[PDB]
């Protein structure tokens, strides 16, 4: 559930909010211009000595559900208790804030499942401190595999650079996965559009509503993305070096594009709703045309079949040619008049 | 009633605007690192000597309809009459004012009844004087109760800091109450969207309008809340210690999140109204399809029934070789043609 | 169209009076006199004095007053330019303010705006009004009976009191607008009719005009509070803040009302559409349980030479044994989707 | 209208539809002097470039491009700027050079016939102490500025050509305000029409203005840019003391944008109110249909059933069958119209 | 897209235009010009070291061999070649110390079938040559070719950076043409929705919404690219050419605002459609209600005067048959007068 409430606990408390409390691993990669070393341990105690390592280090504490390790890394790295609560509070808007000793950033990673329409969000909270980058996640597996491979095989300029470029690389991988997610959302948009244009029913409206809810969730998560990246570029904290400052513009620009795309998607969804409305109105019109064309034809027609079919005794219209087929010509000509009327009106 | 009737009065006058005039209680907790003292009383002159106590003190004055007590406190602790009238002006938007002696902050704490759809509010006014926090409410029933627990249980870090951290703790309790209220409203929105898409009714639009109006009122109350926390965060007077500023930043971020949630809720309900319109249009269209089918299959056949049967003489009928059943057969054939045409059109 | 001409733009030219009350701690002296000469000495009164020039249709009185008190001719033109927005200007010796008094009338959903001009002189306050009828009665009542602290404090507090009375009247107008909005909500939910939609649009226009008038008002009070010219004493800056705060509240309220009205019309649409749905069901459940039965009644009405009408149970009732039953069947159909 | 192809940027071809008129006028004003000229030749206006005092030189009827070319090469103006001057269907924009500032804006003419709007390019070039202004047709909205120069009102004479450009832009903004007043009159008329007498063609009008409003945005929103650059950049050609005046004009442009946006919102509301009124009116028509069908269809039911051929009718000649039929008619009809009164349909 | 999981160094032609291949070279100096078309790379290579400006247009990049050859000879990075061959991407601008890499998309829009088709054109500005790559045969750079051939304008006097400017100017001019075409389409759909609302109107307005989405998605990167071009002032671009790039940037801003206004207009088109269809449903309602009012009571009257039981005012009660016809006519006249008062048809 949304479960926005922690129910008034003291701010210094560290309590986990998410339901992802199965797997806990720590993956550490210390990479220098010439030396790379990686190790995966569940004991944070062997990871904590790398706080003061001169070479850049990427530490990954998967499964923040174990609050003991988060409290311990906060105790060493000088992380504020509020920042640690923000680590654990996975229902926290993405935000960036700069301290005298570290830069603390909160992002969301979105995943989309095919054959269904549901966004699943995983909070990734990362702190750049003393040429090291701590990452805090709640599920094994993430979107930073390209960064891992690049660090492993000396690809790109990441190896020649410090922890600021590691910050940039991680945020860049996350924004790239947002582009992948928006591609999936665009595919869903196209499917729903062809569905509404080709066959509208009573379930396409709930499909459109679910897609619109997904889009508003995306907006609520992505505008804080823009704020975060703008703050990362606009004004340079001492932790971030100028050499890597232009690189942030890249991801910042990317975020802007994402917003635009998401905004556009929103518009499309509204139009989809609109077109459905149009459909039913037009569909309504068609139906009534039939209900009119029959009526205007047969409601008067039966009239004659009534007005010349009463129980009147010795009525004058009796005799004539014969009495029965003389009126049928009138019936046919008035029906043809109605048919021509609705043909020239194109109904 | 929710009507602004402080007009026709001098600005220094103090008149209570709201409706809760039932209970009047004074709760005092003077807490320190070592020991704390609690004091429930109904005489203000007992709580006056707490102004100059060095240890931080918290004075909850509920039921501010007792204007005499508020005037006495304003005279003693040294609060301007405008601030007192704003305390007693229930329809005062949340705000913050940094005076030289104190800081005065008006917030609104809400109550949502799930069974009904009306959302109620009351005003909480906090005055911080570098040694004490005077907070005024309208009635008993609070959200600050967990805060009291900390004071009574030495829990957390509240008992180690000054009165500015107490202001923090109360404001954070209010923001947590707001988060609870948004959870309740989100549940209401889920129920409303389920009813809109599933079973449109006449009362559905009324409930949707009530929810939209409640969300608009909530937004009107929350944007001043964000402004207040921005004021408490970005630039601080000497009243708030530098140690308390990051905590106020936390509360500012919380209020930002709440405002974003309210905006998303407003967009969702605005979409929901049009979704309901489309659904009722579609149901109306299906009813019209039923009507059109029945009309096309029974009115022309009524015209055949009218052709046969008048007052007349000498049409091709001569018992027409028992032609009545074949007349019915032709009638049924026409009906079958109509129904298969509509099945091809997929109207059935 | 001279750049500095003094022409009464407004249309209220039916009444004229002058009300001067020189008030202080010791004593208040109040009078009303059509002659403008009696106004002139109070220019140089040390104690605060309030001069209300009701009716600006006579440009002679407005001119004479401005020329003797030192008001620039262009400021006098702005006074006589009724069709104007709320404004604030600061000079060396006087502060010029233009605000609007709003009147809301029932049974005719319109706003009547009367431009009021306030000039602060550090020794007196000059008020120019379009016509008899002002929202400042609490202020003059306060001055008369020594209520509040208005008598003790100087003309700055007098200007604050007048602007506060204006803002309180704006609150009254907003309360009336809220009552109208509640009535419109009830009407659109229950009795849409036709005049409701035009009243909704008229109230939308009223709120547009109110916002267009109030946002300059909040700018004026922001100017009066954020920067304090030597005319306004420092001791009176907090009081202006209150008015400013009130104005902010007012603006918020207007926006809220706007939002509500923005929904109302849409809600109306939904409501009336739902009404149509019922009119569908009533027409359908009555055009499908009778017309097939009208057909059944017409089947055996075919007067033929041969007919199987000769059958068991004599004539008539034998049809109904199915006929009415068919109607019952129809009900079941509706009962399986709640079309009733 | 944007087809300008097969032409290098240096080509100077006029785009608009006005070619009848051509005049050139000069106002050479100082803090004591004033000179007014009005001719149709470039030789008279040419030597005014080197005048120390501010010189406002206006060219109406820019269709004859050779005068624009002559003032282009004589004043050291890029041929691109000359083409932009002749390019009528070009958005308003301000460009700063090391010598001159070229700002292009639009003047709007609105008259009540057909509820249509027209635009005219006006292009200013501030060069040292000269203002080259170009416009397509005779007549403009700088008559207040002309009177201010002629009769030495205000502080325009005391200042440089920077304040002259300020006054020109402020006059354009004031004309935009008059435009917005006329537009508001038009939406008031349309509101009265839709609220009082909705018609089939009203939608056209209800959308016509809407389209026009969007068009105004396509011109008004660029102005928000061009005045912003007139104070944010504040290049040395524009004096430092002139910036607050451009701040005031920028605020006026923001005000224009707010007014045009709320006008568009009112027009959208007019579309919504028309749709609501049409829905209510068709609802009323179906109400008439529903009462007639409901109260006359069971009447046809009883008429068919008691007037239907049977071998042995139980009624036959039982009693006064015709009064009985009329009585049951009346009973059910009054019952069902009371039902309709309860539903308030009739 | 077509490529998935490939390492970021592979040269694949993602596009679907493989019909035609040709290479045209136009080498122009302020003195003379020389143009020739072929399908070989050997006669294209020598122009790299020629000081005089040259324009080498590779029409048809389905041949990865030729693109690789010219890229590796002209000092173009394999990544840039991959970007050239990668069709489905945003317009890009990249600055290298010896060449400037630009990716733009030129559109073609046909009135008969309302579907705009994109073609990625890629420009590489070296110190003395402009290397252009196109997807298929056909472009809008014909005016630039004419200027080169007939010395029109100042293109021949200037350097190759002015040629890059001229090509981008031609592309934005084609954008203006296509904006005009869609403006005409929007006007046609405005009329059709306003007075002749049908299903095809809704299908076409959704198609226009999608097409305008694609247009803005491709034009905002165009604005960013030209902004970079005239503000970054790279050493490849001369300072004398920057005003031309600024002019093209103004053109692109105008295109962007026009596209946004078109989007707003088309968005309002759907509301206008709902209003018009509601009006049409209202007038059909009117027709049905008029017919019902003027015939259903008359059928009832005929039924109740056609009852088969005996007791009835029959046998010409003062000519009863014209009496009932007169009563029916009076009822019909009352109904039609009431509806004329109601202003119905
Ligand atoms: Mg907390
Ligand atoms: Mg937090
Ligand atoms: Mg008979
Ligand atoms: Mg007051
Ligand atoms: Mg019969
Ligand atoms: Mg050109």
From Swiss-Prot, chain A:
Biological process annotations from GO: cobalt ion transport; magnesium ion transmembrane transport; protein homooligomerization
Effect of residue 309 to A: No effect on pentamerization. Abolishes ion transport
Annotated GO CC locations: plasma membrane
Location in the cell: Cell inner membrane
Residues with site note (Important for closing the ion permeation pathway in the closed state): 291
Effect seen on changing residue 296 to L: Reduces Co(2+) uptake. Abolishes Co(2+) uptake
Site feature (Threonine that confers selectivity for Co(2+) transport) residues: 292
Effect of residue 315 to A: Impairs pentamerization. Decreases ion transport
Reactions performed catalytically: Mg(2+)(in) = Mg(2+)(out); Co(2+)(in) = Co(2+)(out)
Impact reported for residue 250 to K: Increases protein stability. Decreases ion transport
Extracellular compartment segments: 311-321
NCBIfam families: corA
Complex formation: Homopentamer. In the absence of Mg(2+), interactions between subunits are weakened, and dimers, trimers and tetramers can be observed in vitro.
Name of protein: Cobalt/magnesium transport protein CorA
Originating gene: corA
């Amino acid at each position: 559930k949304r479960l926005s409430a922690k129910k008034g606990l003291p701010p210094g408390t560290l309590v986990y909010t998410g339901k992802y409390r199965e797997d806990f691993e720590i993956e550490v990669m210390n990479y220098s211009i010439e030396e790379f070393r990686e190790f995966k341990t569940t004991d944070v105690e062997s990871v904590l000595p790398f706080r003061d390592s001169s070479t850049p280090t990427w530490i990954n504490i998967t499964g923040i559900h174990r609050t003991d390790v988060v409290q311990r890394v906060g105790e060493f790295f000088g992380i504020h208790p509020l920042v640690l609560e923000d680590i654990l509070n996975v229902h926290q808007r993405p935000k960036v804030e700069f301290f005298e000793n570290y830069v603390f950033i909160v992002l969301k990673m979105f995943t989309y499942d095919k054959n269904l329409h549901e966004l699943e969000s995983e909070q990734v909270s990362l702190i750049l401190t003393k040429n090291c980058v701590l990452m805090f996640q709640e599920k094994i597996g993430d979107v930073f595999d390209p960064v891992r491979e690049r660090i492993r095989y000396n690809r790109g300029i990441i190896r020649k650079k410090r922890a600021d470029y590691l910050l940039y690389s991680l945020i860049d991988a996350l924004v790239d996965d947002y582009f992948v997610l928006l591609e999936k959302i665009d595919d869903e948009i196209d499917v729903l559009e062809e569905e509404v244009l080709e066959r509208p029913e009573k379930e396409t409206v709930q499909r459109t509503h679910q897609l619109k809810r997904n889009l508003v969730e995306l907006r609520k998560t992505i505008w804080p993305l823009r704020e975060v990246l703008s703050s990362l570029y606009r004004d340079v904290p001492p932790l971030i070096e100028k050499e890597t400052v232009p690189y942030f513009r890249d991801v910042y620009d990317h975020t802007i594009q994402i917003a635009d795309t998401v905004e556009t998607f929103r518009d499309i969804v509204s139009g989809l709703l609109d077109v459905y409305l149009s459909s039913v109105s037009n569909k309504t019109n068609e139906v009534m045309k039939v209900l009119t064309i029959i009526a205007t034809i047969f409601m008067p027609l039966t009239f004659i079949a009534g007005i010349y079919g009463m129980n009147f005794e010795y009525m004058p219209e009796l005799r004539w040619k014969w009495g029965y087929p003389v009126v049928l010509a009138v019936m046919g000509v008035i029906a043809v008049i109605m048919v021509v009327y609705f043909k020239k009106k194109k109904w």
